[PDB]
């Protein structure tokens, strides 16, 4: 017994093949999942539930593996999925075939490292190529976004609900720009809360100018409906709290026990009049509520809600623009809930809901999802999740690309122009990537169900012409289609990270030459 006592090892071509095989496996289980003609997959969770989604990431997110590079690929998915949302509908699939041809030079006894070098060389050419054939666009023009929005969602089941979602997405993003960074304001996808409520229909689901609380009034008398509410966000609890420093009390005369009892009551009263002093209408706390305080707030005609998640609270704060407070005596009129167009508490059916909309200039809001069932709606928001995602990315970059394989062919021959201009051993790797690129539209045809070879060849033959760069494939016809009229248009950074991530996998995987298990630590 020598090395590690039941830790296996592997080396060389067997290893490299294993990764390639493991890689090749990873893509194909998803190769059907992309396109306007894509499939939609349903999954078995560990814990009993059901998830159905076309977004590959979640599918891969729910995948348990033993092969390491496979686990590597999994993480690769969520990173870009975190990064851009969609294209993971293609991201990994692009990687594996890149590898799939990549192995084709290994038996050529070609050291991968140099094959890596071309891969590096390839990327910059791709990056430069794409920028050349990128398309700047205005951001204020809403309808273009929606087409861009629709284009980005014309792969998911919300295709039939494109118009709403496109509006649904567009409005939500448009109202998110934290301008306190000068002219470098940032939107955030952590305030655009998504709320799934059962019943109703897609059409019933709509964007609400503010936030929703799945709670109910602590006391009946408080109005469930107010025109112009005034709001206080009380981070602190509204009731007596123990003296933190383990204080203790020894009374000697009779009255003190009752007296100290009144004193905490007074302390309660003490807090309230400070609140009523600012003429609020609304009491909000992430904590519980003294009913005795609640009594006086009821006396105050001031509505109170307790025990709310902080995340929503700040959004509530962001909704009416007011700022949260934990110090009632230090309450500031600058944090009044001014800018709440309406307070209401509705009934969805067995649940009270808090309506606070029509803010003057809401920066935060939550979307109310009304559909078929949460898992249906869970799919919906995932389509939303990306749907909002690319939009903000667009608000980062006004540059657009015709995806759908059109840019891809554009890249390919551009490299082919390079490859024949790039004599040397690395040339064959270089043209390999170009040829490797071609599979994504090929998938489309398989997803479409047409003559892939004939279509692609005509496609490639079409794009040998320098005059035309927007020739792509319609998803449903499976015919050569220039993109300008078809309108499937894509943000630059999306495909950027796509290629950007794609290569990083290979080189990372290409260096792999040995296996070691059993760390036991």
């Amino acid at each position: 017994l020598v090395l590690s006592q039941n830790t296996k090892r592997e080396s060389g071509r067997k290893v490299q093949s294993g990764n390639i095989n493991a890689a090749k496996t990873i893509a194909d289980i998803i190769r059907t999942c992309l396109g306007p003609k894509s499939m939609m997959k349903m999954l078995l969770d560990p814990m009993g539930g059901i998830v159905m989604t076309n977004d590959g990431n979640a599918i891969l997110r729910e995948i348990q593996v033993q092969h390491p590079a496979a686990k590597s690929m999994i993480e690769i998915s969520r990173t870009q999925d975190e990064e851009v949302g969609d294209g993971t509908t293609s991201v990994i699939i692009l990687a594996g075939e890149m590898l799939s041809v990549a192995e084709h030079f290994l038996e050529q006894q070609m050291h991968p490292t140099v094959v890596i070098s071309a891969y590096r060389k390839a990327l910059d050419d791709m990056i430069s190529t794409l920028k050349k054939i990128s398309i700047p666009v205005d951001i204020s023009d809403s309808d273009m976004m929606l087409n861009i929005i629709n284009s980005s969602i014309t792969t998911k089941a919300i295709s039939r609900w494109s118009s709403l979602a496109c509006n649904i997405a567009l409005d939500a993003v448009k109202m998110v720009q934290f301008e306190e960074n000068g002219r470098k304001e940032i939107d955030i996808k952590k305030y655009a809360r998504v709320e799934k409520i059962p019943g109703g229909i897609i059409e019933d689901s709509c964007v609400l100018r503010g936030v929703m609380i799945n709670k109910d009034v602590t006391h009946p008398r408080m109005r469930r409906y107010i025109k112009n509410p005034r709001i206080v966000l009380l981070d602190s609890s509204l009731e007596y709290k123990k003296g933190e420093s383990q204080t203790d009390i020894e009374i000697t005369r009779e009255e003190d026990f009752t007296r100290i009892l009144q004193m905490e009551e007074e302390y309660i009263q003490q807090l309230c009049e400070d609140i009523i002093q600012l003429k609020p209408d609304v009491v909000i706390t992430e904590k519980g509520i003294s009913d005795l305080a609640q009594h006086y707030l009821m006396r105050a005609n001031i509505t109170a809600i307790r025990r709310v998640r902080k995340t929503d609270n700040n959004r509530i704060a962001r909704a009416c623009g007011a700022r949260i407070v934990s110090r009632p005596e230090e309450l500031r009129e600058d944090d009044v809930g001014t800018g709440a167009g309406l307070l209401e508490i509705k009934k969805i059916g067995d649940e009270y809901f808090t309506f606070i909309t029509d803010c003057k200039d809401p920066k935060a809001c939550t979307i109310l999802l009304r559909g078929a069932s949460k898992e249906i709606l869970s799919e919906v928001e995932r389509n939303l999740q990306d749907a909002m995602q690319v939009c903000r990315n667009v608000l980062l970059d006004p540059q657009l690309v015709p995806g759908g394989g059109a840019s891809e062919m554009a890249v390919a021959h551009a490299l082919t122009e390079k490859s024949k201009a790039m004599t040397g051993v690395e040339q064959w790797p270089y043209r390999a990537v170009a040829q490797a690129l071609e599979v994504i539209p090929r998938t489309l045809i398989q997803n479409c169900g047409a003559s892939t070879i004939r279509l692609l060849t005509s496609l490639r033959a079409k794009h040998t012409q320098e005059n035309c760069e927007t020739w792509g494939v319609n998803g449903e016809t499976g015919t050569l289609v220039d993109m300008k009229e078809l309108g499937i248009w894509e943000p630059l950074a999306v495909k950027l990270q796509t290629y950007k991530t794609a290569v990083e996998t290979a080189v990372l995987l290409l260096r792999i030459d040995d296996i070691v298990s059993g760390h036991k630590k």
Binding site: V2, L3, S4, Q5, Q66, P68, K71, S72, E75, I76, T79, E82, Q109, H111, P112, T113, I116, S117, D124, E180, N181, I186, I188, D235, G243, E244, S245, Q246, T247, D248, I249, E250, D256, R259, I260, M263, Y267, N314, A317, I324, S326, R327, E330, R332, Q497, K500, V503, E504, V507, L508, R511, I512, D513, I515, V516, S517, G518, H519, K520, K521
Partner: protein, 532 residues
């Protein structure tokens, strides 16, 4: 006669130890040289780790045999000493073990072997200092580029090296530091490296300042500050306790309110005292209370909780802040002084990989450097920093030692022959160990070539000849040369190619292998003990 174990002696264990050593060599023999191929370990449950650097590899690998741990132990010191040579060093020792035993394998007296081995070590270093080339006449940045990009080979980032080392050299040159008043020492680990999966390393950015694996305390709190009013304070912020045992007993109730009142007002005024200075940025390894958060927003200031001490220690150093465990004075009162502030142009938290991290830009008091890593997975990132971690190390040593050695294995190429002739100098039986010591020392190019997959002997023989030729016709200014390549599979002038390595790398290496070989060879018998 021992319970719970037998023993092995003589050739048996002798041979056994060699097998142990060679195995470890074969463990890592594929991770070296500009063509090195990285290693990876499925741990036990899938938390795998790709890496090419042996010290990490060795450290992460379970070992049971003693001597292997010694090499495993040995490398880490070199890791604690160099950072690479992990590409090389362990391979050196066991090979030095390998041939050494072979002499012993007939009859050869080990201590006899040791002395020449001792002689081998001292002889080479002395000649290497007779083969050194100094960088000062050379342009600083260039060889800095060279050795780094030389270090960049065999790594994940070797292709992008020019961007990398260029980033690297700026990073280190900005982390200049004045040492003992007689040294301009450059502190390793001073630069901050944060891994951020996502964009490419092309998009990986150097931070001319400090960046934080931190986030804003309060969503209400501001996010970007264009000002330099920066405070740090180790003192955590909670409504204070009595903090030892100091019991509170009440006989007059009428005061608990004011007791309760003051429990936060102590914190409150401390904040206001802090705020009266006008510091708008505060950092705290300790916890931060929401009451302070509220006032801080009402102060509009910036607050950070739960930050690692090392970083804020670096923070005070660069910004010129004064690290403060508490407020006090040489008089009893807790006061605060603006002079304790640190200064930097702008501090922002920014979302990378959907994650907002806090940045500090351009501290006026002292230059700071951080490096942002963008990559595909966590797997790629945390390995690439290790190289980047090692990347600075050699530069520090290069900065530490105004002296360089050409890369691409010319060292032993020179060494092998010079001792080989010097072997004849001794005249004892020991020079045989020298010849093998040199003979074993030839290991490196062979290791490179097999990973590069060419005829090594012919390459090596060509290497031998040129260096041998470099030892004829003492008009060597037009006959002394240095260099070798693998990418073209032919020798060159790595001096012309810029393939350079820091001297001390080989220096300490040959020493450290010498000791270990000294250690392992002397053994003649192992005795095991079964556990209780």
């Amino acid at each position: 006669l021992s319970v719970f174990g037998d023993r092995s002696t003589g050739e048996t264990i002798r041979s056994q130890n060699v097998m142990a050593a060679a195995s470890i060599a074969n463990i890592v023999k594929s991770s070296l040289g500009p063509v090195g191929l990285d290693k990876m370990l499925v741990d036990d449950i899938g938390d795998v780790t790709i890496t090419n650097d042996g010290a990490t590899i060795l450290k992460l690998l379970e070992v049971e045999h003693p001597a292997a741990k010694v090499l495993c132990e040995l490398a880490d010191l070199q890791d604690k000493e160099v950072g690479d040579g992990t590409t090389s060093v362990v391979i050196i020792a066991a090979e030095l073990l390998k041939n050494a035993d072979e002499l012993v394998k007939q009859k050869i007296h080990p201590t006899s072997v040791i002395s020449g081995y001792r002689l081998a070590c001292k002889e080479a270093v002395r000649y290497i200092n007779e083969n050194l080339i100094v960088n000062t006449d050379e342009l600083g940045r260039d060889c800095l580029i060279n050795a780094a990009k030389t270090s960049m080979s065999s790594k994940i980032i070797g292709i992008n090296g020019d961007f990398f080392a260029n980033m690297v050299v700026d990073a280190v040159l900005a982390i200049k530091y004045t040492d003992i008043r007689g040294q301009p020492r450059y502190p390793v680990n001073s630069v901050n490296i944060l891994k951020a999966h996502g964009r490419s390393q092309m998009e990986s950015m150097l931070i001319s300042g400090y960046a934080l694996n931190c986030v804003v305390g309060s969503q209400g709190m501001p996010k970007r500050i264009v000002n330099a009013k920066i405070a740090c304070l180790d003192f955590s912020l909670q409504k204070t306790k009595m903090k030892l045992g100091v019991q509170v007993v009440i006989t007059d109730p009428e005061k608990l309110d004011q007791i309760r009142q003051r429990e936060s007002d102590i914190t409150k005024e401390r904040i206001q005292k802090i705020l009266a200075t006008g510091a708008n940025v505060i950092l705290t390894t300790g916890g931060i209370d929401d009451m302070c958060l509220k006032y801080f927003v009402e102060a509009g200031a910036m607050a950070v909780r739960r930050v690692l001490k090392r970083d804020l220690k670096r923070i005070a150093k660069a910004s010129g802040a004064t690290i403060l465990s508490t407020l006090a004075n040489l008089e009893g009162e807790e006061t605060f002084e603006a002079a304790m502030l640190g200064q930097a142009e702008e501090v922002v938290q920014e979302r990378i990989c959907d994650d907002e991290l806090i940045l500090i830009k351009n501290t006026k008091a002292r230059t700071s450097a951080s490096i942002i890593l963008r990559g595909a997975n966590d797997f790629m990132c945390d390995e690439m920093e290790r190289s980047l971690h090692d990347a600075l190390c050699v530069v520090k040593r290069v900065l530490e030692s105004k002296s360089v050695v050409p890369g691409g294995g010319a060292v032993e190429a020179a060494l092998s022959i010079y001792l080989e002739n010097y072997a004849t100098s001794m005249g004892s039986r020991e020079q045989l160990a020298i010849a093998e010591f040199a003979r074993s020392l030839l290991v490196i190019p062979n290791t490179l070539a097999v990973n590069a997959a060419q005829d090594s002997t012919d390459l090596v023989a060509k290497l031998r000849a040129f260096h041998n030729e470099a030892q004829v016709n003492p008009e060597r200014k037009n006959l002394k040369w240095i260099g070798l390549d693998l990418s073209n599979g032919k020798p060159r002038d790595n001096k012309q190619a810029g393939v350079f390595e820091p001297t001390i790398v080989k220096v300490k290496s040959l020493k450290f292998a010498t000791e270990a070989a000294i250690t392992i060879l002397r053994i003649d018998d192992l005795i095991k003990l079964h556990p209780e």
